[PDB]
Write an enzyme that holds these catalytic residues in place. Sequence first.
Site, PDB file in Angstrom:
ATOM      1  N   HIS A  50      22.681  93.737  14.409  1.00 54.14           N
ATOM      2  CA  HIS A  50      23.236  95.078  14.645  1.00 54.14           C
ATOM      3  C   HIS A  50      24.333  95.332  13.593  1.00 54.14           C
ATOM      4  CE1 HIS A  50      22.158  95.250  19.213  1.00 54.14           C
ATOM      5  NE2 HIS A  50      21.131  95.586  18.417  1.00 54.14           N
ATOM      6  N   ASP A 154      21.222  91.023  23.992  1.00 54.35           N
ATOM      7  CA  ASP A 154      21.472  90.460  22.667  1.00 54.35           C
ATOM      8  C   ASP A 154      21.012  88.993  22.631  1.00 54.35           C
ATOM      9  OD1 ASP A 154      22.756  92.738  21.593  1.00 54.35           O
ATOM     10  OD2 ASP A 154      24.741  91.854  21.479  1.00 54.35           O
ATOM     11  N   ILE A 371      32.780  99.912  21.528  1.00 51.61           N
ATOM     12  CA  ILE A 371      33.863 100.125  20.555  1.00 51.61           C
ATOM     13  C   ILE A 371      34.388 101.542  20.596  1.00 51.61           C
ATOM     14  CG2 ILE A 371      34.377 100.128  18.078  1.00 51.61           C
ATOM     15  CD1 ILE A 371      32.337  97.727  17.884  1.00 51.61           C
ATOM     16  N   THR A 372      33.519 102.566  20.693  1.00 49.47           N
ATOM     17  CA  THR A 372      34.053 103.924  20.693  1.00 49.47           C
ATOM     18  C   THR A 372      34.967 104.183  21.877  1.00 49.47           C
ATOM     19  OG1 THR A 372      32.030 104.711  21.813  1.00 49.47           O
ATOM     20  CG2 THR A 372      32.159 104.930  19.405  1.00 49.47           C
TER      21      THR A 372
END
Length: 455
Positions: A50, A154, A371-372
């Site tokens: 990613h 993941d 993260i955002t």
Amino acid sequence: TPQICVVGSGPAGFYTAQHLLKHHSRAHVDIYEKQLVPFGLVRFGVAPDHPEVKNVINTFTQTARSDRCAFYGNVEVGRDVTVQELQDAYHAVVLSYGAEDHQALDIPGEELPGVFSARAFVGWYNGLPENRELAPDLSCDTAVILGQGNVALDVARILLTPPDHLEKTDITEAALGALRQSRVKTVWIVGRRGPLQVAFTIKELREMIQLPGTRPMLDPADFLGLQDRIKEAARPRKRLMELLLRTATEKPGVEEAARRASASRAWGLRFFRSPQQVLPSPDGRRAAGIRLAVTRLEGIGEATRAVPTGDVEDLPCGLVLSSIGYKSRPIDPSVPFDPKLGVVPNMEGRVVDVPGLYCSGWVKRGPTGVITTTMTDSFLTGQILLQDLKAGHLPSGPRPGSAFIKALLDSRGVWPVSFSDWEKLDAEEVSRGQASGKPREKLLDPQEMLRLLGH
Ligand SMILES: Cc1cc2nc3c(=O)[nH]c(=O)nc-3n(C[C@H](O)[C@H](O)[C@H](O)COP(=O)(O)OP(=O)(O)OC[C@H]3O[C@@H](n4cnc5c(N)ncnc54)[C@H](O)[C@@H]3O)c2cc1C
Ligand SMILES: NC(=O)c1ccc[n+]([C@@H]2O[C@H](COP(=O)([O-])OP(=O)(O)OC[C@@H]3O[C@@H](n4cnc5c(N)ncnc54)[C@H](OP(=O)(O)O)[C@@H]3O)[C@@H](O)[C@H]2O)c1
């Protein structure tokens, strides 16, 4: 000249610093970090396949290169420098140190070789130095992951991707080597609740469904009556459920059935099962299965919970990964800490009863955002801090900042890693990647890293 310090160089520390420097033309921001390198979970959490998600490093790098920002890696706040020393040297201090503690399963058998937290396995393939010797045994044919969130996808994705497709990522050469020899051909991702309670998102679920060399294993019985209950769901959620639903119930066309039939690997979702005990091999040397308690759901909406039915299921496997969350760890005696939620108690980023002390990111709100989410939350903290600064609520007058701190660190024998030191290791990691065709080849050995950092 306002002096502010940030503890932790992950997305919360860097976005807090970016807001402060953008909205206050004179303030200086110093970012302290325990690891020898910056960026936190962007380097050590986000998957190697990613790379798109890691591009926020370019803006973090522009902030760190600016005249009013400095980085001090290899400094463990709470150990090498205390929070009170930081409070005495700066006008404000922001705790942005993440959630380092994995939640344990707390079940018998958790100690058997072959059982690991998902974050430790991720830290192994992403080069976090502390996990370099994890040495997971991939000689078994089946892996079981507990928890149905994006971290679980993941780990499943990395275990099942044809290794050649990982060759040009920044995955460690050591882990790719281990993946080339892996015998794992099946991965089950098990949740206590049902399909409507999954925590993963659509990008990751689609990558799994479309992963070359694999076929999906979903039981249509787990989805009976789903379309009906999702008619009033939010758009993104409904789209995710419709994709799962199609995958579980639609019969594939001729080409896709052929592709699925020739696949050498498979992954699946199991629902209504909670981990009861890890089962050992006959000689006790490794994990050989997982005993799950059958469950049924009670309650409505987000209040729904799994309750045991009394039945159990044993599921054979040689690798067990727990992907069930995190908690922050206490950092220093001067900082209040809530062991229950595993966060520093705070009111919109102001630490309870500690003037001048703030927090941002996972340590502020708990370990749930992307993260955002961490970025916009850090901006919220940055706004309250700057309003407190402009209004004269912080100490008035000078504050020495790093001049004071470095004089303490100088005497204690702690030599912090500056950003220019990191740039030297970054260039080395990137160049070593050129020969092999990778973005970089991470250095894993702290001693070698220190040499390449100029230490
Ligand atoms: C396995 C995994 C995969 C993820 N994948 C994605 C993804 O694909 N996309 C996405 O958007 N989000 C992803 N996330 C979520 C993202 O990682 C978090 O939103 C974000 O990193 C939280 O930021 P943070 O700054 O609070 O914490 P962190 O990123 O953890 O950073 C905290 C920093 O503080 C440092 N620190 C700790 N203790 C100290 C101390 N005592 N002194 C000084 N420094 C200290 C840590 O070393 C670290 O660098 C993932 C998370 C995990 C765990
Ligand atoms: N691409 C992206 O946007 C992205 C990629 C990676 C990671 N991240 C994020 O990083 C954050 C961390 O993720 P995460 O996967 O570890 O956690 P998460 O998203 O919150 O999911 C973990 C969980 O494990 C389950 N659980 C808890 N305790 C359990 C127990 N004892 N036994 C069995 N199951 C148990 C819970 O499910 P139940 O409550 O029903 O049981 C819950 O789903 C997330 O917010 C994730 O979205 C984001």
